[PDB]
CSV table of C-alpha atoms in Angstrom, one decimal:
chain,number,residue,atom,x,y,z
A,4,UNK,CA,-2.3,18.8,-37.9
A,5,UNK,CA,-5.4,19.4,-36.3
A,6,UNK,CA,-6.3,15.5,-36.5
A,7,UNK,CA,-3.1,14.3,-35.3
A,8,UNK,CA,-3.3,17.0,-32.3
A,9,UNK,CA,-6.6,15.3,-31.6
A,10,UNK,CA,-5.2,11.6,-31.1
A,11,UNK,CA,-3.2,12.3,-28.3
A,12,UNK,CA,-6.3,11.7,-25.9
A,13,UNK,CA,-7.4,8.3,-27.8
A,14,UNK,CA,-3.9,6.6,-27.7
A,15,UNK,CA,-3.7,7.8,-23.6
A,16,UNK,CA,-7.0,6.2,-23.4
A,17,UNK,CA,-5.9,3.2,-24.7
A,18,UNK,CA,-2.4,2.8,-23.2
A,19,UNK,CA,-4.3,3.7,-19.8
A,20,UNK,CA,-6.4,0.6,-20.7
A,21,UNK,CA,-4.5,-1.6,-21.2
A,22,UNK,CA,-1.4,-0.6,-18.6
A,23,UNK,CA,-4.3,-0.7,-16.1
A,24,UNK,CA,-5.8,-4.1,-17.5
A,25,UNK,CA,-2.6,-6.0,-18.5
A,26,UNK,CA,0.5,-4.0,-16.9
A,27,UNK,CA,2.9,-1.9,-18.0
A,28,UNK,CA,5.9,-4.3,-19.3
A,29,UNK,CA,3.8,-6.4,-21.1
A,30,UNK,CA,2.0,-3.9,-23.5
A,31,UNK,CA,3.6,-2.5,-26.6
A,32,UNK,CA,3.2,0.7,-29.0
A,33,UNK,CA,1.9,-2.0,-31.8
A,34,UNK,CA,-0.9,-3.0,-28.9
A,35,UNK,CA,-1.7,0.0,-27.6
A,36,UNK,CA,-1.9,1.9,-31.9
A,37,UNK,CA,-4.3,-0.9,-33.0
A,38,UNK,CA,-6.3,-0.5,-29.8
A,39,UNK,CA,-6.5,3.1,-30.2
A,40,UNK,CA,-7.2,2.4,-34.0
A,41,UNK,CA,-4.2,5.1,-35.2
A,42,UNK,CA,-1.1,4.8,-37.0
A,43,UNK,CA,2.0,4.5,-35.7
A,44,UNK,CA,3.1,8.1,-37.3
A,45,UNK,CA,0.4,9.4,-35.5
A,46,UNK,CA,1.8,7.8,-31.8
A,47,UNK,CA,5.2,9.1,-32.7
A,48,UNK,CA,3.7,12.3,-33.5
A,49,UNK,CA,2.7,12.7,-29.6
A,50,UNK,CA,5.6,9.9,-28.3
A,51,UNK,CA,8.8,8.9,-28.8
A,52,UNK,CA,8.5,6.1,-26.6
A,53,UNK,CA,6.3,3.7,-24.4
A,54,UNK,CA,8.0,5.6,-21.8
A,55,UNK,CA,6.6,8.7,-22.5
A,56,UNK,CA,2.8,7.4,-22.3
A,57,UNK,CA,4.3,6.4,-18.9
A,58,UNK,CA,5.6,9.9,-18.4
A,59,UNK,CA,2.6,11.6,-19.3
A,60,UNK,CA,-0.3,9.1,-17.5
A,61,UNK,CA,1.4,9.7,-14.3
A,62,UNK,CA,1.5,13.6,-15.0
A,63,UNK,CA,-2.1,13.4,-15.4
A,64,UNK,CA,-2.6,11.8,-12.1
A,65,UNK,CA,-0.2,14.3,-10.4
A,66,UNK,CA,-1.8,17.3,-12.1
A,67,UNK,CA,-5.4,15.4,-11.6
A,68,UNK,CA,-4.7,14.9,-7.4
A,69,UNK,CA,-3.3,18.6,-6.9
A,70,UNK,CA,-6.0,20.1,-8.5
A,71,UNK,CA,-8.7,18.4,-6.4
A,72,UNK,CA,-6.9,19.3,-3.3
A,73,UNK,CA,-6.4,22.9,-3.7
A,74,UNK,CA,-9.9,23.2,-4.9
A,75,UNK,CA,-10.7,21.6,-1.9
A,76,UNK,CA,-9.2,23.8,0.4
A,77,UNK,CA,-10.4,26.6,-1.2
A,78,UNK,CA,-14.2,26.4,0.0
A,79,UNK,CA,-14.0,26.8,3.5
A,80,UNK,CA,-13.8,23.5,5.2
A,81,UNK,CA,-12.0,22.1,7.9
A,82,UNK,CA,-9.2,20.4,6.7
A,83,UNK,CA,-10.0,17.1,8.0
A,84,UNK,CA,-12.9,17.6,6.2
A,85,UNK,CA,-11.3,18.6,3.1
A,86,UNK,CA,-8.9,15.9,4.0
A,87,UNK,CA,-11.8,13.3,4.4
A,88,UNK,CA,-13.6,15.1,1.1
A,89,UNK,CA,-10.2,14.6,-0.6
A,90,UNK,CA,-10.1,10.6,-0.1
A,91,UNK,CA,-13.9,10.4,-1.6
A,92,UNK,CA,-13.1,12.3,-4.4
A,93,UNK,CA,-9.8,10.7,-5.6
A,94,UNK,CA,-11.7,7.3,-4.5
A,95,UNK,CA,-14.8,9.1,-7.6
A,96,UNK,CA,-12.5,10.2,-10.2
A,97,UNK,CA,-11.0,6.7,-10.3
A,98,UNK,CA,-13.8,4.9,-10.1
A,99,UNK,CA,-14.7,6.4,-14.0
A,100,UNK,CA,-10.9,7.4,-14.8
A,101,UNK,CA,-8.9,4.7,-16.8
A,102,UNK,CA,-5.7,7.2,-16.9
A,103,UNK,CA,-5.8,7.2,-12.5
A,104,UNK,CA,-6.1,4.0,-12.5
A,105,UNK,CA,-3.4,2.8,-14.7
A,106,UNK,CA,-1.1,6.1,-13.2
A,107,UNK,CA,-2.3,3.9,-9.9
A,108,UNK,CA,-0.9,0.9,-11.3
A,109,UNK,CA,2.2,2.4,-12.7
A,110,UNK,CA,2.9,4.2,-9.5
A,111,UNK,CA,2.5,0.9,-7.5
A,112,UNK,CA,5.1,-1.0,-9.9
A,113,UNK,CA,8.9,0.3,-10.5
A,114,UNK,CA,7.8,3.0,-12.8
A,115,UNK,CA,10.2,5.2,-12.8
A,116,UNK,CA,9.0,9.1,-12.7
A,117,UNK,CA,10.8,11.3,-14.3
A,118,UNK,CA,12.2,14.7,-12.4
A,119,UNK,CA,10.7,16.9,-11.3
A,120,UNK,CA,7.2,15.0,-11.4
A,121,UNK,CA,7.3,13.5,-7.5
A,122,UNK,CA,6.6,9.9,-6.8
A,123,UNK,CA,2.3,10.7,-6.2
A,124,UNK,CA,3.1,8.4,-2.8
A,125,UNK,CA,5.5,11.3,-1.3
A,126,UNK,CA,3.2,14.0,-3.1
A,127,UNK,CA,-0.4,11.9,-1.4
A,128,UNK,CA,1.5,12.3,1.5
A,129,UNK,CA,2.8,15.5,1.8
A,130,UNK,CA,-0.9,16.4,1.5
A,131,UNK,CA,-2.2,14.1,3.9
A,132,UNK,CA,0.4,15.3,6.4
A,133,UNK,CA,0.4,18.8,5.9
A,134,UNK,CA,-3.8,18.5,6.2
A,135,UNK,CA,-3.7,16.1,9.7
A,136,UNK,CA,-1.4,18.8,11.4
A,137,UNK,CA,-3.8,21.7,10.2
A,138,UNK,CA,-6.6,19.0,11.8
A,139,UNK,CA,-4.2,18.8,15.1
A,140,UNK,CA,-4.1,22.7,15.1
A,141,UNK,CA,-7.8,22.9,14.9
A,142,UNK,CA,-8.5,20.8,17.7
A,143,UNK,CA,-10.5,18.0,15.3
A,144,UNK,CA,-7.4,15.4,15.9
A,145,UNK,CA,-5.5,14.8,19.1
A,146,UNK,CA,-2.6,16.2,20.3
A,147,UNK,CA,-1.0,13.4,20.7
A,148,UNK,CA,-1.1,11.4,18.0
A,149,UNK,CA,1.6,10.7,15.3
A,150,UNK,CA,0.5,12.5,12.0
A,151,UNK,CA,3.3,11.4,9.9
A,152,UNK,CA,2.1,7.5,10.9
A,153,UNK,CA,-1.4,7.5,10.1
A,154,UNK,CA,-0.2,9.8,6.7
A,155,UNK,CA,1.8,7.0,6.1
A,156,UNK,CA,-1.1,4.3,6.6
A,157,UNK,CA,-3.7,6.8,5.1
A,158,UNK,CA,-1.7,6.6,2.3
A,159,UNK,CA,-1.7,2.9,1.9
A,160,UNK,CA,-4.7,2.7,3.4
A,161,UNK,CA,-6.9,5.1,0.3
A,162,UNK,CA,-5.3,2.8,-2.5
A,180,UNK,CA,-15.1,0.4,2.9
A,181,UNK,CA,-13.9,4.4,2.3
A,182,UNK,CA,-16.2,5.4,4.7
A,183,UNK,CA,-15.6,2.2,7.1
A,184,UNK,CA,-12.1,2.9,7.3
A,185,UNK,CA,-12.5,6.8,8.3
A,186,UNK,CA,-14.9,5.4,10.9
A,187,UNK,CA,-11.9,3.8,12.8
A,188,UNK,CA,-10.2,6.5,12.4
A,189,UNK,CA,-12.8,9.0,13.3
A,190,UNK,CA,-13.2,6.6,16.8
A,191,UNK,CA,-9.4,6.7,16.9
A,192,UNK,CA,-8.3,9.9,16.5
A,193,UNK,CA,-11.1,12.3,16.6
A,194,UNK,CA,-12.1,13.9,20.3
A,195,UNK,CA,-15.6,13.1,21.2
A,196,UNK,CA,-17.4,16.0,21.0
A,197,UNK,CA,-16.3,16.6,17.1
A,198,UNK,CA,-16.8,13.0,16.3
A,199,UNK,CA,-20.3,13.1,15.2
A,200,UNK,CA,-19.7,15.4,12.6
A,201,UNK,CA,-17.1,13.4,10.7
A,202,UNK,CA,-19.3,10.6,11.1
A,203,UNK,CA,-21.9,12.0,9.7
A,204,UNK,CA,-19.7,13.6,6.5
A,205,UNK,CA,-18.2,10.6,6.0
A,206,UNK,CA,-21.8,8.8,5.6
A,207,UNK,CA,-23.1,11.3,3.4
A,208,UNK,CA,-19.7,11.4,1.1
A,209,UNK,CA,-20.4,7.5,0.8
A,210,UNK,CA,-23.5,8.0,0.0
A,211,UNK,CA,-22.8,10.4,-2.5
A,212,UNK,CA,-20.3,8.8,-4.2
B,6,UNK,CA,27.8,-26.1,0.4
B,7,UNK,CA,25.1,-26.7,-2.5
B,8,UNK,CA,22.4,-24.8,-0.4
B,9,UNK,CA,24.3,-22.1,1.1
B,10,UNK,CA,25.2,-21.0,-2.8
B,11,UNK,CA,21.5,-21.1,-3.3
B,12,UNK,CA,20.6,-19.2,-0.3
B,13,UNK,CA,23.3,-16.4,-1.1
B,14,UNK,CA,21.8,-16.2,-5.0
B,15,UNK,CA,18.3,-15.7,-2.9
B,16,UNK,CA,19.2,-13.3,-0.8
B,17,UNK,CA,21.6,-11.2,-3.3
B,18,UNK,CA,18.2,-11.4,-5.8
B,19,UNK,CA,16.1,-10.5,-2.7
B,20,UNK,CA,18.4,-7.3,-1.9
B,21,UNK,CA,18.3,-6.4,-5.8
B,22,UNK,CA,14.9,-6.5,-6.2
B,23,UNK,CA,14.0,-4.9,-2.7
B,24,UNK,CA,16.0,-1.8,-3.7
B,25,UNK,CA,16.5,-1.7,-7.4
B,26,UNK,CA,12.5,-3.3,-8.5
B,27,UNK,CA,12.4,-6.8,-10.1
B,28,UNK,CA,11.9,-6.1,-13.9
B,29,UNK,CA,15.1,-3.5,-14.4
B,30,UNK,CA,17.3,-6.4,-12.2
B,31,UNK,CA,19.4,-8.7,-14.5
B,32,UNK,CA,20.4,-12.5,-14.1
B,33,UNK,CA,23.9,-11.1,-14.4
B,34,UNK,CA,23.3,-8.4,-11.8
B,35,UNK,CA,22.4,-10.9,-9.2
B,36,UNK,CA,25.4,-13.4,-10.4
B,37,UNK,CA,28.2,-10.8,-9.8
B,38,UNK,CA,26.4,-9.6,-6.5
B,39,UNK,CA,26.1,-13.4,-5.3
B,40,UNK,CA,29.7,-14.2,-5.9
B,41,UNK,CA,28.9,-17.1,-7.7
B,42,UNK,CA,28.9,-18.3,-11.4
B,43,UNK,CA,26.4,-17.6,-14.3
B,44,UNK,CA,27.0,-21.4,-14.3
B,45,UNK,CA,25.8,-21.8,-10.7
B,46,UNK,CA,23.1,-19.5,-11.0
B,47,UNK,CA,21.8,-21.5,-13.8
B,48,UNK,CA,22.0,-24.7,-11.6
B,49,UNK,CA,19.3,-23.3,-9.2
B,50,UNK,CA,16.7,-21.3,-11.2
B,51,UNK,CA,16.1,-21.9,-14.8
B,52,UNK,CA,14.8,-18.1,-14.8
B,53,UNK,CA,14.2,-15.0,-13.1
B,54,UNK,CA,10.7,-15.9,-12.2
B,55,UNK,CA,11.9,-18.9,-10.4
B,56,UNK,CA,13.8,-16.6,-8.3
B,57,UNK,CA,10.8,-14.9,-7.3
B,58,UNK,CA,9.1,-17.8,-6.8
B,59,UNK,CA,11.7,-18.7,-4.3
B,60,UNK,CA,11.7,-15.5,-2.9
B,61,UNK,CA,7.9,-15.9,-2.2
B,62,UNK,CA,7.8,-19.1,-1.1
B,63,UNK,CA,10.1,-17.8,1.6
B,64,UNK,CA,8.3,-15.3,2.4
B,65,UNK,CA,4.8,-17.3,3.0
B,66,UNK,CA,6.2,-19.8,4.9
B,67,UNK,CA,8.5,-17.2,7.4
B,68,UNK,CA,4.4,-15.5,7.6
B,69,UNK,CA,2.5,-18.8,8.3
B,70,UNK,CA,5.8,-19.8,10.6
B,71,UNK,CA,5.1,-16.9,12.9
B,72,UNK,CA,2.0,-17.5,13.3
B,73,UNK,CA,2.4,-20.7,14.2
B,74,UNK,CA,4.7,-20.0,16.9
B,75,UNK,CA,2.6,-17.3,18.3
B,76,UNK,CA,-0.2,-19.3,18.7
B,77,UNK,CA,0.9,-21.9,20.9
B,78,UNK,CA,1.7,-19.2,24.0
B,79,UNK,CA,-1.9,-19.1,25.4
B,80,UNK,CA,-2.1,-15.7,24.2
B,81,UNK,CA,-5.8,-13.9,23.8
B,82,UNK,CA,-6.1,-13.6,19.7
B,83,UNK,CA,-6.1,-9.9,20.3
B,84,UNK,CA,-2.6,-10.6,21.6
B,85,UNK,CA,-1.4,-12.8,19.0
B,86,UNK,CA,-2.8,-10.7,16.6
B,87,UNK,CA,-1.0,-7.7,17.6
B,88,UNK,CA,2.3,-9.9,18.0
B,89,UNK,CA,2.3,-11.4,15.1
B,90,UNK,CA,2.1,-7.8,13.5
B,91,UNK,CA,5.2,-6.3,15.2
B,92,UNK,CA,7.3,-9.5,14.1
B,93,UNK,CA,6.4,-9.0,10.3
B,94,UNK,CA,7.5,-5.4,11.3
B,95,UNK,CA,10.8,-6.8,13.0
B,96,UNK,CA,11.4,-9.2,10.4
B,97,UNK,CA,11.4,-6.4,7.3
B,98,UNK,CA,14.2,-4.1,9.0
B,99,UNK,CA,16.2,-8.0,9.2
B,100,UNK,CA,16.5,-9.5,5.9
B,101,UNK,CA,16.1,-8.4,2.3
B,102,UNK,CA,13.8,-11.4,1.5
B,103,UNK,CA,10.5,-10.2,3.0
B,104,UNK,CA,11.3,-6.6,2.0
B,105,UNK,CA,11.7,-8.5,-1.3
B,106,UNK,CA,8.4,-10.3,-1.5
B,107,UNK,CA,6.3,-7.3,-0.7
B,108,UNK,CA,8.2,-5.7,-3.3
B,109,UNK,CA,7.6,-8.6,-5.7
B,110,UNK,CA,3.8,-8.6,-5.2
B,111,UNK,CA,3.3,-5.2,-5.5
B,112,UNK,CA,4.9,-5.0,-8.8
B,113,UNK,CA,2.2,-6.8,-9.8
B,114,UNK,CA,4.7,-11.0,-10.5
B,115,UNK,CA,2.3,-13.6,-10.7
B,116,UNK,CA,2.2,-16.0,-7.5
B,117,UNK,CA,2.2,-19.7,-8.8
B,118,UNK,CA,0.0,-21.5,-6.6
B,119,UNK,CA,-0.9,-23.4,-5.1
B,120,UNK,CA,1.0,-20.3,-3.1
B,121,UNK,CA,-1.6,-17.6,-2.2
B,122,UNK,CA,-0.6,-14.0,-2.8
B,123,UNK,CA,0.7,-12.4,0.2
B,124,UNK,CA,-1.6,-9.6,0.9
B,125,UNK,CA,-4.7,-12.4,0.7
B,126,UNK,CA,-2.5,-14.6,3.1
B,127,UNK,CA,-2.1,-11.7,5.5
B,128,UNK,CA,-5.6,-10.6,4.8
B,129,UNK,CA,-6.8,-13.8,6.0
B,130,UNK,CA,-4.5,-14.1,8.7
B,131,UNK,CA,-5.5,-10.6,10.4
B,132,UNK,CA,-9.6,-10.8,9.8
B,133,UNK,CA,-9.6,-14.5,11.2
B,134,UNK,CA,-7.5,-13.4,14.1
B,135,UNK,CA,-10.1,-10.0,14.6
B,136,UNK,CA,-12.8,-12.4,14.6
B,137,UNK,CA,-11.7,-14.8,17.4
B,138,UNK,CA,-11.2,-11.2,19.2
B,139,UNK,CA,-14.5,-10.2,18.9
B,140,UNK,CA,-15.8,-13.5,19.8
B,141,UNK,CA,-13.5,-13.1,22.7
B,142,UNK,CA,-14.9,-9.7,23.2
B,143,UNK,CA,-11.8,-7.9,23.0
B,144,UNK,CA,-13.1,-6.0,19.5
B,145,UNK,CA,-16.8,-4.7,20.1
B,146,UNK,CA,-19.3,-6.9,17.7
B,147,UNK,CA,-19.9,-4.3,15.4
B,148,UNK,CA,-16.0,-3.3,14.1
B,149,UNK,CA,-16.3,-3.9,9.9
B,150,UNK,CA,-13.0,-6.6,10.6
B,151,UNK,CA,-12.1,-6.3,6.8
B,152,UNK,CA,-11.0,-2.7,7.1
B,153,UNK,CA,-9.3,-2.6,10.2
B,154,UNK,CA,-7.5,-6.1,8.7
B,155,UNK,CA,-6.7,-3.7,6.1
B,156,UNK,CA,-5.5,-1.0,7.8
B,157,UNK,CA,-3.4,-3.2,10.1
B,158,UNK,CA,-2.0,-4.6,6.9
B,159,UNK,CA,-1.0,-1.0,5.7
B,160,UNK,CA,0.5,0.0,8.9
B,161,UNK,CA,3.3,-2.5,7.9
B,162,UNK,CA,3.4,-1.9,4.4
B,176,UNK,CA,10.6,3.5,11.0
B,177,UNK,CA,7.8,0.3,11.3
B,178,UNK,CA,7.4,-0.3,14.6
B,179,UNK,CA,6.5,3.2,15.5
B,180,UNK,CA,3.9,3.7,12.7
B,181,UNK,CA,3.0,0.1,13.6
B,182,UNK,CA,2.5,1.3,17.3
B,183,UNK,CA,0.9,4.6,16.7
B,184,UNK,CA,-1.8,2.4,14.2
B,185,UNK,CA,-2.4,0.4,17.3
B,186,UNK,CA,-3.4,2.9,19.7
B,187,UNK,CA,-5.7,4.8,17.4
B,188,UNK,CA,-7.5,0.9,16.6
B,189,UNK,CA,-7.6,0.3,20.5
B,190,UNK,CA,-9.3,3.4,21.0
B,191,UNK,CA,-11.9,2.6,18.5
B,192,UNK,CA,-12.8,-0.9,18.5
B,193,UNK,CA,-11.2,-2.5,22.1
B,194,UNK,CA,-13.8,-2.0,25.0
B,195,UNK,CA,-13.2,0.4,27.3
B,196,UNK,CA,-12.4,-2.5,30.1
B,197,UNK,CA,-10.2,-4.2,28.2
B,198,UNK,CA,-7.9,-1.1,26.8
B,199,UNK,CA,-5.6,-0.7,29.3
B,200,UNK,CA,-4.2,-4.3,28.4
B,201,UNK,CA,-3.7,-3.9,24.9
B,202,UNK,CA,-2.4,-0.3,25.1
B,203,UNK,CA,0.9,-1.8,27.2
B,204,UNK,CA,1.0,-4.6,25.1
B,205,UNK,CA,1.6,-1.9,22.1
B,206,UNK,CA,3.6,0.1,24.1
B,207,UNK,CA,5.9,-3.2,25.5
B,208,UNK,CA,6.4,-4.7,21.8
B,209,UNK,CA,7.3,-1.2,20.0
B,210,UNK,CA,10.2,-0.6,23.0
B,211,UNK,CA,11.2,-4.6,22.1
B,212,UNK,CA,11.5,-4.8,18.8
């Protein structure tokens, strides 16, 4: 058992690969098994289905982007600098993650998730959101501007990091607190 | 009669597609949705690619279209620029065919050229239009044009409000401070319009 429990990763790893290189539709169990250099018992051992490599890639990235932001607001930061620390991070773990990137890539097609995962656009979000107003309420974002818009772009925006955060640093940000962002958002470039 | 068949198999594809995805939408889906016969359907697109072929094709040519009437109106390019945004906007709440397009290219169908894919064309689009500002000097020299092009792009992606509030926060970080006023009212005037 013990072997077969310890393919599951490999034959991930390879269906991330190659959803994230050739798409979703158009790879197959028999692709994906020789890829992953396993036997087809041992893929049914972990899935029934190509749909449940779907299933469980985009769980990763679910369980993957929650874990980073509660960790992040954990240590004491300003949450639009956890917000801003969140955005580098993801932007890191994907960079060197296959499995994000293809969850990525299966989010962006019509893959459907399966209840009660959320769709990781409503869940990126309802994270951006919820951390803009907290921004709002500490006086680091103006009063006046629309959170659930620039949650919206953000969103879009995320899928030149620190480029972007420097408009809306310029944008959004009252003076006197700019120059702080500015300065995070230059070292988190230069960190990651 | 011929064309008005064809344009009703578009548009019931285009409405499919927009709300259902492309790859889980069947010919005979679209067929019975149309009105028309599997017969008919046949006699305009040999396949389901060719549908969204169609479908894109519209879709570039509605984008380069815009921007062509835009920029006969002596407007500044900051002006046409942020015109040009709002109609897109308008013109997704309108028809299922542009709703359809974006839809097509983010599930990741092939564009067969020599068609360019429509986040490059509207890529293109907004960073030549930022640079023509900045040469105007209505965007200060040093704004990095491929992110706000970006961001502007994303705004898009209600529509006019998000598309609105996206302006404001751009104006106050890359318009000078002279020139602000102008481009604020403009925002303002197109969001109330469309």
């Amino acid at each position: 058992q013990l072997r077969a429990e310890q393919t599951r990763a490999t034959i991930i790893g390879a269906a991330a690969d190659l959803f994230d290189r050739r798409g979703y539709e158009s790879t197959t169990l028999s692709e994906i098994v020789a890829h992953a250099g396993v036997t087809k018992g041992a893929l049914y051992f972990h899935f029934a289905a190509k749909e449940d490599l779907a299933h469980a890639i985009l769980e990763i990235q679910s369980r993957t982007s929650r874990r980073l932001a509660k960790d992040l607001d954990g240590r004491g930061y300003s949450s639009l600098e956890a917000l801003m620390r969140l955005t580098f991070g993801m932007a890191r773990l994907c960079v060197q993650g296959p499995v994000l990137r293809a969850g990525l890539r299966l989010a962006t097609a019509g893959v459907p998730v399966r209840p009660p995962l959320p769709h990781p656009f409503t869940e990126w979000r309802e994270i951006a959101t919820s951390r803009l107003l907290d921004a709002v309420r500490q006086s680091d974002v103006h009063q006046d501007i629309d959170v659930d818009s620039v949650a919206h772009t953000l969103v879009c925006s995320v899928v030149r990091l620190a480029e972007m955060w420097y408009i809306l640093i310029r944008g959004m940000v009252p003076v006197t607190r700019r120059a702080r962002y500015v300065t995070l958002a230059a070292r988190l470039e230069q960190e990651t």
